[PDB]
Symmetry: C2
Subunit: 197 residues, 2 copies
């Protein structure tokens, strides 16, 4: 069966204010921030921020819509969705008193929508983009990026293969020929396994 | 609301064979193993094995009861329970082809059942045992251990306080005066936060 699970603790970058659909459904959008550590192409330990949108809809939005502050730490469990733009739809949140131990985890299980295409960065690090179809855990389509040894291993997979991903949500940069920078949320794989079948 | 969630990938240490309650309900008990890393009292990076029992009951037990092998990697999501003896009750499993990136994670949220009692090991490392009452996510009672700075911080909490724990499942040793060793599964806290309230 498909899986699509996200666990995050982050800090609110603005005060959330409730909004409503035209039908009256409550919407509470949170903008969360945190950091994660990585090792760069030259072996240096670094941190880079992540910023992600978390949407509460309906009962969770009404529950919290007048209780949260900019600067407050929030624990979220939810799923990845669109609205393009990958966002987290919260199943629930628990605001924290918040006065390392990073929490930014994603678990996906699904089937590749196309063959992986292995590339190498200019510095020769292996990298692959994988397209995954997840049947709720109709069909959702999610992009996953993997690096180094996991990219080389993922290159053996083919369209259709089942895949379990344990990863984290990151922000990727796209730069135009003229120096313009846009940002895209994606899943970075930290572990990949194959489900039996 | 309470939370009690466990995520594990481990290797089967024996072939699982289905058993039945007297009422016919299927039981499939898996014995899983893995490793986790820690830093010991002298700053040395070490690994120590974990061994944990995972129980499938009913439909998941029937689904997998003739399909799993000793040596096979299994992904589990479930909850902690007794049967004393802390075990994982699987919500579901996904056997893996399995031909680092450790997965042994527990998320608990509940309320302390007593004041924390801070101690120091002979080498002067801070350590605390916390008792947590979790109302399903009737009341379950679960023990959590925290070390070093998190033990010192946890010492400020009191019976009744809400607590979110992000941790992992470990095996603790008890040694009698005569050198006999027994083992106990417990949760080691890796992050602790306070839910608002």
């Amino acid at each position: 069966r498909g899986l699509n699970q996200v666990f995050l603790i982050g800090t609110l970058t603005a005060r959330p204010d409730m909004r409503y659909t035209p039908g009256g459904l409550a919407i509470l959008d949170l903008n969360l921030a945190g950091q994660d550590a990585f090792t760069d192409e030259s072996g240096q330990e670094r941190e880079v921020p992540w910023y992600h949108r978390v949407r509460l809809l309906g009962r969770q939005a009404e529950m919290w819509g007048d209780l949260l502050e900019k600067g407050q730490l929030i624990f979220v469990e939810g799923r990845l969705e669109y609205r393009s733009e990958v966002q987290v739809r919260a199943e629930f949140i628990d605001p924290l008193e918040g006065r390392r131990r990073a929490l930014n985890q994603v678990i996906l299980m699904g089937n590749l929508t196309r063959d992986p295409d292995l590339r190498y960065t200019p510095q020769g690090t292996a990298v692959v983009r994988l397209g995954l179809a997840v049947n709720e855990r109709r069909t959702h389509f999610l992009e996953v990026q993997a690096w180094r040894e996991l990219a080389e291993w993922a290159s053996e997979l083919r369209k259709g293969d089942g895949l379990l991903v344990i990863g984290r949500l990151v922000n990727d940069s796209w730069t135009s020929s003229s120096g313009e920078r846009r940002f895209q949320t994606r899943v970075e794989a930290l572990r990949l396994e194959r489900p039996t079948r």
